[PDB]
């Protein structure tokens, strides 16, 4: 039934509470639900049901819904991976949940367990004790401290580990990878006062040079713990420069060829950079932000082979948070919009669906013809995407049109992209035409529907197969209708797209009749029969309908 | 040189046995993959070494061992990448070995639900199998063509590419199972597939043209004995995407 | 037969056989599957001599959704979503309703519940699912015996009754159809509002139904082949 608790390091975004932020949550929530279905590891879902994504994040309590964690899960976690990672619970959550700031899980007394284990492990690594066992005991402390709940547990751990650091040999490897993040986690819960900060900075700075790659990855999780603190200026002016030089050195080299390199190293380095740019924007160097955004762009602009899928989604979801965070300088934010549009136009449905999410957050963060160059990317992705992409692009499109354009500027494109012989999915476009016309009827703007129906009726009678011309007009007259019981039938029209039985002709006659009874003056009432008469050959649906109108 | 490479294979397999104990034999919830990170770094240095020593087939062996490990340890996307690196290192000198490696990459992409990626690896295999194995193929390459044909047709019925992504090779494959004109029977077999499996594939491709879901349900139980379990998973996804389409949010 | 001389073709295909073939192609629906053939047969006979209101919409939706089919279920769920809430329950509880719509209806209705609003469709589909689950459990033998593929050891009292219940076609096809709907409800039931959690009077019927469904699937393996 269950998987391990997560308490992520990143707070809820305030941008999503704004008027346009609320509108972004609906549209980017549609795209999120489809990225989850397509690339989630599904590790906590047993059954096939596509839309059952949840995260083990309780209200610091009951679970917070996946909708309300939108860009909150830690960047270095693979999508849907519920396995234990170094970083499960943030220091702000240890503080807020335990009422410490610088015991029973499900009836079980976990205070008794964690107290007993601190007593054993401290006496067993500080006696003459087997070296094969010390690292496994310190692994146990690093893990079990997610259960610790009183400050004296972290004090006892910090003292024990900082003694073990001077007791154990300086040539170590298999211990250091646990000792560094365990010491930093303890030190971070203890608040990084000068009594602890200088020892911890010296351990972090020196262990970033370690040849063993897990000792570097452990140092980077140590850094991610200590960066949650309200650091003192004399630590921030010395520690932050060492991290930023280490990040710019190791990312800038590998970014063109990521798959040659260990995935957890690239993922943890990105997570540090995103937390630095969001939370330390004044303290990190002037080339930072800009240079990170460029070399993350070089990862996203890779191939399906050179940039692995989990690193593609990490880097993208990180950049996407940095832009809804208000903290970018405008030249960095505008550079990220330029990086987004070049990655929607790609082969793979999931890589394009993610790049669409990024484009949407850019466009709702920016709130005059330049929006039209963006909408033509959405229409192109309906034309050239697989059905599983194009059906999603068609569901978001009505709101994107209504939020960025006056209807008149896109009404030409909406009807043309439904009529085009180069449209593979006219049954997806039918619901777009419907939602655009029913929006105009809701805003009292019903005259614009009389106009655009009659202005385009002769393009519809030029559809090449008569089944596809009798259809399409049935969608159009359903989409134009003011009667609610007619406007309800669109799914029955869409399910019959290829058909031309007597009921498909009768429906076309009825729905064209009711528009002619209730929405069409004599000059229109005649011109409608004139455009119809051109195709009213003795057996055609148009002849059968001309008899119903002419009587 | 070869002794240093050997020692790195043993030192990698040590961390990889240690990972298998924690992950597969103990099923430990606290098994974050520090030994796997050490194994992937160790083989990264050793693949660099075997390629500087100019022997691609010995580097490809490390890539197959790591790819198999990542698949067993529940990371099929990372496995599919290492199987394609093995295939690329084998292909200039051992075409059947490269086809075997691409077949495992395609199985890993299917485990990872990356169906458009699996479709592209099966097309690469069917090309390479005609290019090195030929219109009749030799028996080993013929078994690869037979896998690729059946897998590609089910993947194309699952994904249904638009005209913009219906490649010449996809259109050419599908038309064998389809009708060109209103009085055409559909094409006769070239003898590639058993006649019974070929008639059931033509029936399936035709039932998806005429939207006959009762026929697809009947053909699913009838084809079950004839398919591999991987192909029975593909055919399950075709019947599932037929009855409950993805991308609607319902 | 059209290209040949009529006096030979009228002897090859008598009018009584032409009329038998014509009636059969209509009654089987094969006329609509093979329209060119039926058109050629009726040619051979010639050669051998509204207001769209609520209740119209309900008649339209009935023509799609009171069937047996699996062809357009997401579109069918949207059509019953526009039937009025006071008509919905009686529309779904009728014998002629398509039980394949219930999972689509629960999935569509849940997307309204997760949008912050009441779903009449979800309420009707949940009640109909639970009522049908209880209604088929009432047909099981009153004392349950363990399913054992090797030995139907209790013949008259029990295994004869299961051999009549499973393999009926009409009942057996209903069980995994209902189980698709029951599973669509059980995967959401923890996310739902408090009044839409599982009724405590239904919990035994649900366990009896789940057991009977794996027993029916096992019975189908033994007497036929791999289930769908």
């Amino acid at each position: 039934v269950s998987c391990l608790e997560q308490q992520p390091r990143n707070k809820p975004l305030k941008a999503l509470d704004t008027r346009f932020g609320r509108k972004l949550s609906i549209i980017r929530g549609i795209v999120e639900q489809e990225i989850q279905a397509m690339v989630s590891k599904r590790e906590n879902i047993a059954t096939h049901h596509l839309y059952q994504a949840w995260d083990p994040v309780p209200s610091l309590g009951a679970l917070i819904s996946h909708e309300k964690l939108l860009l909150q899960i830690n960047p270095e976690r693979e999508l849907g991976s519920m396995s234990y990672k170094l970083g499960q619970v943030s220091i702000h959550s240890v503080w807020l949940g335990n009422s410490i700031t610088p015991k029973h899980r499900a009836g079980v007394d976990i205070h008794s367990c964690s107290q007993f284990l601190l007593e054993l492990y401290s006496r067993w690594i500080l006696p003459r004790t087997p070296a094969i066992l010390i690292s496994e005991v310190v692994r146990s402390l690093l893990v079990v401290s997610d259960l610790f709940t009183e400050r004296n547990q972290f004090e006892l751990m910090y003292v024990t580990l900082t003694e073990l650091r001077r007791v154990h040999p300086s040539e170590d490897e298999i211990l250091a990878q646990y000792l560094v993040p365990a010491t930093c986690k303890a030190a971070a819960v203890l608040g990084m006062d000068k009594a602890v900060a200088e020892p911890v900075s010296r351990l972090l700075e020196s262990t970033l040079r370690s040849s063993h790659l897990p000792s570097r990855v452990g140092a980077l999780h140590g850094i991610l713990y200590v960066l949650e603190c309200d650091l003192l200026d004399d630590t921030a002016k010395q520690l932050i420069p060492v991290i930023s030089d280490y990040l710019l050195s190791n990312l800038k080299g590998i970014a063109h060829c990521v798959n040659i390199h260990s995935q957890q190293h690239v993922l943890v380095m990105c997570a540090t950079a995103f937390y630095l740019i969001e939370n330390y924007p004044l303290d990190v160097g002037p080339e930072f932000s800009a240079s990170i955004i460029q070399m993350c762009g070089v990862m996203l602009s890779g191939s399906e082979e050179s940039t692995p899928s989990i690193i593609y989604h990490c880097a993208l979801r990180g950049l996407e948070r940095l832009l809804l965070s208000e903290q970018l300088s405008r030249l960095d934010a505008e550079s990220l919009v330029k990086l987004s549009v070049d990655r929607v136009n790609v082969h793979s449905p999931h890589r394009a669906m993610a790049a669409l999410g990024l484009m949407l957050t850019c466009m709702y963060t920016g709130k005059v013809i330049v929006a039209m160059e963006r909408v033509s990317v959405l229409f192109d992705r309906i034309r050239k995407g697989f059905p599983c992409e194009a059906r999603v692009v068609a569901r978001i499109l009505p709101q994107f049109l209504d939020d960025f354009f006056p209807p008149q500027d896109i009404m030409n494109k909406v009807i043309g992209e439904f009529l085009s012989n180069q449209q593979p999915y006219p049954q997806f476009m039918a619901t777009v035409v419907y939602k655009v016309f029913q929006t105009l009827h809701s805003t009292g703007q019903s005259s614009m529907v009389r106009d655009w129906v009659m202005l385009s009726l002769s393009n519809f009678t030029q559809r090449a197969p008569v089944a596809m011309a009798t259809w399409s007009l049935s969608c159009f007259f359903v989409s134009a209708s003011t009667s609610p019981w007619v406007a309800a039938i669109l799914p029955h029209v869409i399910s019959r797209m290829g058909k031309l039985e007597q009921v498909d002709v009768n429906l076309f006659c009825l729905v064209a009749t009711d528009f002619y009874r209730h929405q069409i003056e004599e000059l229109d009432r005649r011109a409608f029969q004139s455009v119809l008469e051109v195709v009213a050959a003795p057996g055609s649906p148009y002849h059968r309908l001309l008899t119903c109108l002419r009587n | 040189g070869p002794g240093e490479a050997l020692a790195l294979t043993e030192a990698a397999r040590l961390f990889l046995r240690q990972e298998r104990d924690a992950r597969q034999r103990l099923v430990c919830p606290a098994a974050y993959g520090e030994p796997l990170q050490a194994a992937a770094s160790a083989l990264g240095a050793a693949v660099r070494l075997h390629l500087e020593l100019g022997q691609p087939a010995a580097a490809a062996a490390l890539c197959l061992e790591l790819a198999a490990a990542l698949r067993d340890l529940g990371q099929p996307a990372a496995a599919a990448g290492h199987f394609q690196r093995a295939a690329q290192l084998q292909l200039p000198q051992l075409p059947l070995a490269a086809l075997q490696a691409l077949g495992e990459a395609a199985s890993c992409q299917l485990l990872a639900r990356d169906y458009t990626g699996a479709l592209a690896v099966f097309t690469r295999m069917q090309r390479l199998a005609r290019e090195h194995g030929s219109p009749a193929a030799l028996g080993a390459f013929s078994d690869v063509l037979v896998r690729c044909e059946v897998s590609r047709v089910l993947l194309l019925l699952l994904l249904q590419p638009p005209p913009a992504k219906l490649l010449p090779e996809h259109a050419q494959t599908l038309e064998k199972y389809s009708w060109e004109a209103f009085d055409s029977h559909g094409q006769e077999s070239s003898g590639q597939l058993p006649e019974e499996l070929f008639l059931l594939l033509q029936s399936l491709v035709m039932a998806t043209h005429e939207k006959d879901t009762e026929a697809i349900k009947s053909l699913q139980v009838e084809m079950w004995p004839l398919l591999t379990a991987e192909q029975n998973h593909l055919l399950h996804l075709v019947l599932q995407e037929t009855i409950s389409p993805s991308g609607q949010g319902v | 037969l059209l290209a040949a001389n009529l006096q030979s073709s009228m002897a090859q295909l008598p009018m009584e056989e032409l009329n038998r073939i014509q009636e059969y192609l209509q009654s089987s629906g094969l006329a609509q599957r093979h329209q060119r053939l039926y058109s050629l047969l009726d040619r051979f006979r010639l050669s051998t001599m509204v207001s769209p209101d609520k209740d119209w919409y309900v008649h339209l939706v009935k023509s799609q959704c009171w069937t047996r089919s699996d062809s357009a279920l997401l579109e069918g769920a949207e059509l019953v979503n526009r039937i009025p809430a006071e008509d919905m329950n009686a529309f779904m509880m009728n014998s002629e309703f398509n039980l394949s719509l219930l999972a689509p209806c629960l999935s569509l209705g849940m997307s309204e519940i997760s949008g912050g609003q009441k779903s009449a469709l979800f309420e009707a589909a949940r009640e109909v699912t639970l009522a049908r689950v209880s209604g088929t459990v009432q047909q099981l033998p009153a004392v349950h015996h363990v399913f054992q593929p090797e030995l139907p050891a209790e013949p008259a009292a029990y295994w004869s009754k299961l051999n009549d219940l499973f393999g009926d076609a009409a009942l057996y096809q209903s069980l995994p159809t209902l189980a698709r709907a029951l599973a669509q409800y059980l995967v959401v039931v923890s996310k739902l509002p408090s009044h839409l959690h599982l009724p405590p009077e239904k919990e035994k019927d649900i366990v009896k139904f789940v057991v009977a469904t794996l027993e029916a699937l096992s019975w189908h393996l033994i007497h036929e082949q791999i289930p769908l």
Partner: peptide, 17 residues
């Protein structure tokens, strides 16, 4: 009969019979 749609390879449309 049915015939292939020209706008999509997987879509088919009716023609009068």
């Amino acid at each position: 009969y049915l015939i292939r749609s020209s706008f999509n390879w997987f879509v088919f449309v009716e023609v009068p019979c």
